[PDB]
Amino acid sequence: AVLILSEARSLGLTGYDFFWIVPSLVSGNTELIPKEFPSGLISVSYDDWDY
Amino acid sequence: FVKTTVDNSFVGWDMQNVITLDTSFEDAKTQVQLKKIHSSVILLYCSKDE
């Protein structure tokens, strides 16, 4: 995922109208986010703040 | 000159996306600017290597 994002930012695929959707297993623990993840990235995941 | 010729013409030509790309040749902006073109005929004005 990190390599794909880095290779896609340089290709212009990451602009003001480009919505990325990502499965639950990429957002591992929501506490080790790298620097290549663009802002506004929807990714459904299981709950840990509640329950 | 091409603008002047196309303007005062009796046939009527359609023209879109007049690109003037000068920023490296593979750095983001050139890619999208080249991707904007979707018609099929191209006029380009360069110097051999470019």
From Swiss-Prot, chain B:
Q: Which domain of life is it from?
A: Eukaryota
Where in the cell is the protein located?
Answer: Cell projection, Dendritic spine; Cell membrane; Synapse; Postsynaptic cell membrane
Q: Name the job this protein performs.
A: Component of N-methyl-D-aspartate (NMDA) receptors (NMDARs) that function as heterotetrameric, ligand-gated cation channels with high calcium permeability and voltage-dependent block by Mg(2+). NMDARs participate in synaptic plasticity for learning and memory formation by contributing to the slow phase of excitatory postsynaptic current, long-term synaptic potentiation, and learning.
What's in the domain note?
Contains an N-terminal domain, a ligand-binding domain and a transmembrane domain. Agonist binding to the extracellular ligand-binding domains triggers channel gating. A hydrophobic region that gives rise to the prediction of a transmembrane span does not cross the membrane, but is part of a discontinuously helical region that dips into the membrane and is probably part of the pore and of the selectivity filter.
Q: Which family does it belong to?
A: Belongs to the glutamate-gated ion channel (TC 1.A.10.1) family. NR2A/GRIN2A subfamily.
What do we know about how this protein assembles, alone or with others? Heterotetramer. Forms heterotetrameric channels composed of two GluN1/zeta subunits (GRIN1), and two identical GluN2/epsilon subunits (GRIN2A, GRIN2B, GRIN2C or GRIN2D) or GluN3 subunits (GRIN3A or GRIN3B) (in vitro). Can also form heterotetrameric channels that contain at least two GluN1 subunits and at least two different GluN2 subunits (or a combination of one GluN2 and one GluN3 subunits) (in vitro). In vivo, the subunit composition may depend on the expression levels of the different subunits. Found in a complex with GRIN1, GRIN3A and PPP2CB. Found in a complex with GRIN1 and GRIN3B.
Q: Which disease is it linked to?
A: Epilepsy, focal, with speech disorder and with or without impaired intellectual development: An autosomal dominant, highly variable neurologic disorder. Features range from severe early-onset seizures associated with delayed psychomotor development, persistent speech difficulties, and intellectual disability to a more benign entity characterized by childhood onset of mild or asymptomatic seizures associated with transient speech difficulties followed by remission of seizures in adolescence and normal psychomotor development. Rare genetic variations in GRIN2A may be associated with susceptibility to schizophrenia, a severe psychiatric disorder characterized by hallucinations, delusions, disorganized speech and behavior, cognitive impairment, and social withdrawal.
> Which protein are we looking at?
Glutamate receptor ionotropic, NMDA 2A
This chain's source organism reads Homo sapiens
Name the gene that codes for it.
GRIN2A
From the entire protein, which fragment is shown? 186 to 235 of 1464
